[PDB]
Amino acid sequence: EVETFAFQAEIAQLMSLIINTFYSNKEIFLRELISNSSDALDKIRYESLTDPSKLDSGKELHINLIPNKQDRTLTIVDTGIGMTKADLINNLGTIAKSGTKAFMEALQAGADISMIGQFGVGFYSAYLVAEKVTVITKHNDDEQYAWESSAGGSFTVRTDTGEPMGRGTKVILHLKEDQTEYLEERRIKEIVKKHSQFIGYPITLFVEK
């Protein structure tokens, strides 16, 4: 049972700007997704300070980067707080309507796309490099769900029958054909060292056969 939703007009406009604007510094997508993962890990850590049972779904707090050249996917996995179904539908837990408004005002006022994270909508920078994004998520208070969008104004949400996650979020980037440099170990390592050197959780870059 797959449910199809329309993006709010302002979010569709944000994604079309990300997809259509000429902007060479695409590597910032990874910084933005890792920062989102760190924010999600912060949230479940804070909740666990007064309720240790919040970690019954997994004690380890970490971020994994999993490139797969055969599938042409880059997956960012975190064991953070995850999102409920309501969170997924409500722009993946963001205030994306007001954030887009502030972002697009900054763009005509000098800013560039690399500052997207300052407006709370850094997730959508995934579409700098991905033709399709799949988000698998599990929150302690809900079931496991899969969100998916190839932009074009709509997204889908369905119950996920795949590998149980325990708790957290998995962002699967189905990369554009000319963006496969972000599957290379040395390229990912360079970006993490440049932009994510002070993230307070272990970031493990998986290798391939």
Ligand X SMILES: Oc1ccc(Oc2ccccc2)cc1
Alpha-carbon distances, residue 120 vs 7, 58, 116, 135 (angstroms): 17, 27, 7, 17
From the list 171, 173, 191, 192, which residue makes contact with ligand X (rule: CB under 6 A)?
171
Q: Which is nearer to ligand X, 22 or 37 (CB)?
A: 37
Site for ligand X contains 29 (CB under 6 A): no
Q: Which is nearer to ligand X, 80 or 99 (CB)?
A: 80
Q: Which is nearer to ligand X, 39 or 108 (CB)?
A: 39
b/e burial code for range 163-194 (CB count within 10 A of at least 16 → b)? eebebbbbbbbbbbeebeebbeeeebeebbee
* Whole-number Å distance between alpha carbons of 66 and 203: 11
Site for ligand X contains 123 (CB under 6 A): yes
Q: Which is nearer to ligand X, 40 or 183 (CB)?
A: 40
Q: How many residues bind ligand X (CB under 6 A)?
A: 16
* Whole-number Å distance between alpha carbons of 19 and 7: 15
97 is in an annotated binding site: yes
Site for ligand X contains 36 (CB under 6 A): yes
Site for ligand X contains 41 (CB under 6 A): no
**Alpha carbons within 13 A on the beta-carbon side of 167:** 21
155 is in an annotated binding site: no
* Whole-number Å distance between alpha carbons of 54 and 175: 34
x/- string (CB under 6 A) for ligand X, residues 81-120? xxx--------xx---------------------------
User: In the chain, at which residue ranges do the beta strands (DSSP E only) sit?
Assistant: 3-6, 63-68, 73-78, 130-138, 145-149, 154-159, 168-175, 203-205
Site for ligand X contains 174 (CB under 6 A): no
Q: Write out the residues near ligand X by the rule CB under 6 A.
A: 33, 36-37, 39-40, 43, 78, 80-83, 92-93, 123, 169, 171
Binding residues for ATP: 36, 78, 97, 123
